């Protein structure tokens, strides 16, 4: 399947809740690395990175990010001045990463933002930087003269992918796991709406549908948002609000990884009945 490696850096001016610089590394959107300017140490966040990399790897990662912290410190001071906002609490963000497809083909991105809005973005096809506003144009010219786009593209297409392949091997079992949803039909009151709740599944893609008697039914259906669990799994629910349900046989069908689970009215649970 497709896999990705992504880094997200957060720079902050003025405390206290968070340090000046925070970095998080993720494979398939799951954190495997952490760093901040309080501890000045890069640390592992998953078993698979722990068991496959050690002191040398982390010393180097720490060293790179200490530099990142220093650069972010200087960068945010500059952009704040350009917005004449140097007094208040502000933010400087960087996200970049690569994707490796079954294909063998790859994708990559490199972006920066100030106060949560686009500043400069990499176009690795034209090897230029897209400036979102006048404040970013000076940076665009500077970076294009320093060949930053060429270096970034080089990293995204080579270094990033080479390490992603390593990481995928390290955590193959976890990253390629397929966990079916646990499904329940919830109802507060015999007269209340009924919720089809699916949880503990991975990957996050899931489809919840209602049927009446039935071939499927999508009137009076409220599909909720995909939500993250605390353990890296996901959950999602859908609510049915229909008229007195009594004379018609409703059911919930949850599909995940080409497999379906059905729950009927006989399955409905509640507090305290």
């Amino acid at each position: 399947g497709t896999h990705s490696l992504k880094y997200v850096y957060t720079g902050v001016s003025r405390g206290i809740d968070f340090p000046e610089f925070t970095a998080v590394g993720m494979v398939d959107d799951g954190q495997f690395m952490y760093f901040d300017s309080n501890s000045m140490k890069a640390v592992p966040k998953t078993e698979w990175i722990r068991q496959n990399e050690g002191a040398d790897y982390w010393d180097r990662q720490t060293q790179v990010l200490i530099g990142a912290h220093q650069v972010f410190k200087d960068s945010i001071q500059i952009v704040m001045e350009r917005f004449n906002q140097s007094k208040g609490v502000h933010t400087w963000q960087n996200m970049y990463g690569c994707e490796l497809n079954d294909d063998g083909t790859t994708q990559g991105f490199y972006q920066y933002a100030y106060d949560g809005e686009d500043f400069v973005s990499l176009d690795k096809n034209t090897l230029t930087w897209t400036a979102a506003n006048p404040q970013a144009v000076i940076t665009k010219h500077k970076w294009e003269a320093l060949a930053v786009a060429e270096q970034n593209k080089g990293y995204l297409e080579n270094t990033c992918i080479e390490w992603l392949k390593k990481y995928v091997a390290y955590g193959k079992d976890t990253l390629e796991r397929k966990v079916s949803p646990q499904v329940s039909l919830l109802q507060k009151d015999p007269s209340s709406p009924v919720t089809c709740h699916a949880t503990g599944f991975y990957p996050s893609g899931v489809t919840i549908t209602w049927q009446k008697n039935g071939q499927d039914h999508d009137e009076d259906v409220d599909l909720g948002e995909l939500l993250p669990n605390e353990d890296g799994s996901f959950q999602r629910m859908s609510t049915l609000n229909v008229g007195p349900w009594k004379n018609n046989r409703f059911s919930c069908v949850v599909e995940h990884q080409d497999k379906t689970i059905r729950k009927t009215e006989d399955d409905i649970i509640t507090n305290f009945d």
Binding site: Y7, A23, G25, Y57, R60, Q61, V64, L65, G67, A68, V71, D74, S75, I78, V79, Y96, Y112, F119, V120, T139, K142, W143, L146, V148, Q151, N152, Y155, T159, C160, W163
Partner: peptide, 9 residues
């Protein structure tokens, strides 16, 4: 592994 090369804006 993080990109070792950064430039200030």
């Amino acid at each position: 592994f993080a990109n070792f090369c950064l430039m200030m804006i």
